Amino acid sequence: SMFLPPPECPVFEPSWEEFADPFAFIHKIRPIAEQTGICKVRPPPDWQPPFACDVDKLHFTPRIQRLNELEAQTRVKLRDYTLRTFGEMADAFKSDYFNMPVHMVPTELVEKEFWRLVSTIEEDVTVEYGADIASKEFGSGFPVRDIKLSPEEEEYLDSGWNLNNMPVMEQSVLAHITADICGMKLPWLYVGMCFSSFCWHIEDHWSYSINYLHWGEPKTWYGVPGYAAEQLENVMKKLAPELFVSQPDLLHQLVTIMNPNTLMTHEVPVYRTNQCAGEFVITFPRAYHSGFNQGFNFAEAVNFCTVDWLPLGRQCVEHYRLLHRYCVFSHDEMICKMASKADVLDVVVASTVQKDMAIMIEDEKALRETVRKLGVIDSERMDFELLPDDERQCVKCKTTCFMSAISCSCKPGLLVCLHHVKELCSCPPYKYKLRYRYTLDDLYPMMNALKLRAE
């Protein structure tokens, strides 16, 4: 009546055989889980990675969070608690809030109460949490190579479900991005407390995320299937238009808390789950998700990109251009890097990259014909990958240039992508230069190498 819990998302319990290869598994469940946006995966009973830490030596800087529905919050960027003193604070907070033993409050009640307090103007609840990538002060919850590791640790060093390994596996596509994308390719560590919350969002470049709860009280999730992303955005834009104003950069992305019943009222499908310790949650491309912690806990999450995702990745960058949103990396640069390594690619990867590259090349061909017809005649090869990211964004749409751009000696260092030739300066186009990474004659052999590898 006050809060009606969304229907449960799918839960999978793979056999060790099914589980072993995360990429095969995710591909298998995809027709089901992409309809719900998120799903939960329970590992085989004896898949049990070792969790061991000195709570007195793990330190982190706490972030502070107000809990008001529809209020703007800023996406996190990469004071001090130890894990012990954070834990003591967190447990006392929850215990005091409910006047109940810290681990005896029903999950249904915490959820109900979360949605009450965020919607009540009178209530001014603030909580704290940890969020950052692994560091010497607070390392991964999974085993990593370095000290003498136990045999138990050794066993899980190379697991496909060890989140440190996920990015660099063979069927991962984000693997050999040579660009610095630490915030995206490295796992994030999250230390939660009762009500600490992550606002509604999708992943950068519409990637997947895989999320593991190492220990502690459950994490409550809400998820929306990718097909309803724009429906959700329209609902939010109606209720919180200030979140949709143009953002100056990626450090000023605005996100918010919003009751899933509000989405369900507006015919947006929403699913829920309680993720418990030892369980995975997977989010699918462009699947909006949000959630909050039931209590003191420790989670680890990483983005990843399969071959299934490649065409969506291209669509996402198109979408970013139309919205004038900054990119985390150049999709075309990633594609060309993979083509340049065609001989060592997994063959299914090679086949899928070939297809995206074909689209890339035909789009590039047409764009170059168009700018030639606008009077741009001079050209010069340019190694875009050498430029700092913030030195090769299109002045107009902020896209990260790689295949080509237009420059003018009138505006030293400024670039526009080929969609925005008219947005650079008032000089006539014959003053312009087409800067290009590859000629069309360079590109066809690169694509052919992929075809040969794919056989």
Ligand SMILES: O=C(CCSc1nc(-c2ccccc2)cc(=O)[nH]1)NO
């Ligand atoms: O969750 C399961 C069965 C997982 S397999 C499964 N799940 C759903 C499904 C589940 C939740 C929401 C929407 C669809 C539909 C289907 O055809 N198969 N175990 O408890």
Ligand SMILES: O=C(CCSc1nc(-c2ccccc2)cc(=O)[nH]1)NO
């Ligand atoms: O988005 C997710 C869920 C990861 S689980 C999580 N995320 C945050 C969080 C997320 C973003 C910024 C700040 C905190 C806090 C927390 O306690 N848990 N994976 O795709």
Ligand SMILES: [Mn+2]
């Ligand atoms: Mn306890």
Ligand SMILES: [Mn+2]
């Ligand atoms: Mn996320």
Ligand SMILES: [Mn+2]
């Ligand atoms: Mn425009």
Ligand SMILES: [Mn+2]
């Ligand atoms: Mn703008």
Ligand SMILES: [Zn+2]
């Ligand atoms: Zn542009």
Ligand SMILES: [Zn+2]
């Ligand atoms: Zn000029």
